[PDB]
């Protein structure tokens, strides 16, 4: 198998000492990680400023900035993160606000097979909620076949004219096991995400999450990166899936977790190329 050996080669390259993950290992941060073994690299982690001065450690969230290229702007970058825990919802909105993120991609349900993959961090439709110092209104939900779009308005309580719209694209039909058997739904979803992000002047990085912030998160991010290369350079451009996975894995460990996800990435690229040909 060309895929198996490509994916195994990549998996071998992570069977070694990787960059430091010390902040995530601090005792004060242990309950901020869904999984003890999945921690952000220190050098690309999102550092949360402006925290409660009573909290001894208030600068940590299990999240990393992911740039597709070395000199990427914030608007062309991503934040890869885990689904919120009950005790990290407020930190998640601190992150979205601080980094000026305007689009969130959620790749799980809240619960799958009886396990929490993300605690609900948005209000019910039309409702207003306070999450720490942040205020969020769910303005409107729009349901599609594979996803729901929620138009959220985020502001900082006690600072006026900080409001901005945050568009949550919630993919809801990813299977409990494996990957979708074809990429059409994911490609249609990423096309809407991309057009929304592109339309917002000076948007910050797109936030992408899954239960650990690496498997489905890495699969969505690498597909999005590759189809943007095709968008820009056209369907005969060089595409290097292993090198792109290596680029994102230098910024958060373990991105793209399974051989089925690896094959799905190739499938999505091929279908996108085909689409650019029929229409």
């Amino acid at each position: 198998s060309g895929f198996w050996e490509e994916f195994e080669t990549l998996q071998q390259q992570e069977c070694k000492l990787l960059y430091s993950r010390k902040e995530g290992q601090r005792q004060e941060n242990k309950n901020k990680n869904r999984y003890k073994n999945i921690l952000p690299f220190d050098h690309t982690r999102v550092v949360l400023h402006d925290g409660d001065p009573n909290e001894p450690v208030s600068d940590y969230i299990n999240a990393n900035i992911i740039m597709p290229e070395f000199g990427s702007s914030g608007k062309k970058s991503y934040i890869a993160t885990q689904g919120c825990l009950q005790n990290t919802v407020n930190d998640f909105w601190r992150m979205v606000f601080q980094e000026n993120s305007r689009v969130i991609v959620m790749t799980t349900k809240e619960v799958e097979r009886g396990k929490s993959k993300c605690v609900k961090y948005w209000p019910d439709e039309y409702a207003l909620k306070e999450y720490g110092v942040m205020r969020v209104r769910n303005v409107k939900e729009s349901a599609a076949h594979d996803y729901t779009l929620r138009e959220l308005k985020l502001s900082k309580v006690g600072q006026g004219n900080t409001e901005r719209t945050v568009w949550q694209y919630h993919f809801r039909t990813w299977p409990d096991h494996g990957v979708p058997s074809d990429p059409g739904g994911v490609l249609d979803f990423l096309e809407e995400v991309h057009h929304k992000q592109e339309s917002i002047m000076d948007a910050g990085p797109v936030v992408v999450h899954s239960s650990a912030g690496i498997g489905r998160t890495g699969t969505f991010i690498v597909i999005d990166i590759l189809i943007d290369i095709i968008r820009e350079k056209g369907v005969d451009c060089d595409i290097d899936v292993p090198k792109t996975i290596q680029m994102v894995r230098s910024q958060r460990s373990g991105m793209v977790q399974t051989e089925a996800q690896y094959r799905f990435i190739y499938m999505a690229v091929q279908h996108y190329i085909e689409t650019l040909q029929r229409r």
Binding site: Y35, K36, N37, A212, I214, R216, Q257, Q261
Partner: peptide, 9 residues
């Protein structure tokens, strides 16, 4: 199962 580790599995 039960280790507390993420297994996408």
């Amino acid at each position: 199962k039960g280790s507390g580790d993420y297994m996408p599995m």
